[PDB]
């Protein structure tokens, strides 16, 4: 953002995960729930935050898949958006 001689002073521009981590989390027999929200901080830095979460197999579960039904996915997504909005 600015130069102070031999120094380049930076400011935050964005955050991301690596490619291999994101590719490592996505696997079969589970439901992926993603949400995004557009939201402005107090000083005028309108952001777009992306969230992701995966359904978890229980330790004593013997069924192969762990799939959330559509209403469960919708209210999980609603919780994600409300939490991100209230946090930032």
């Amino acid at each position: 953002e600015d130069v102070q001689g031999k120094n380049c002073l930076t400011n935050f521009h964005g955050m991301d995960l690596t490619r291999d981590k994101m590719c490592s989390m996505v696997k079969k027999w589970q439901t992926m729930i993603e949400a995004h929200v557009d939201v402005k901080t107090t000083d005028g830095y309108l952001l777009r935050l992306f969230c992701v979460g995966f359904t978890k197999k229980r330790n004593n579960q013997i069924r192969k898949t762990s799939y959330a039904q559509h209403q469960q996915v919708r209210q999980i997504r609603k919780k994600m958006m409300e939490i991100m909005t209230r946090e930032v």
Binding site: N60, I62, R63, K64
Partner: peptide, 8 residues
């Protein structure tokens, strides 16, 4: 009732 080894 944790018999029945996990499926798949």
């Amino acid at each position: 009732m944790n018999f029945k080894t996990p499926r798949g």
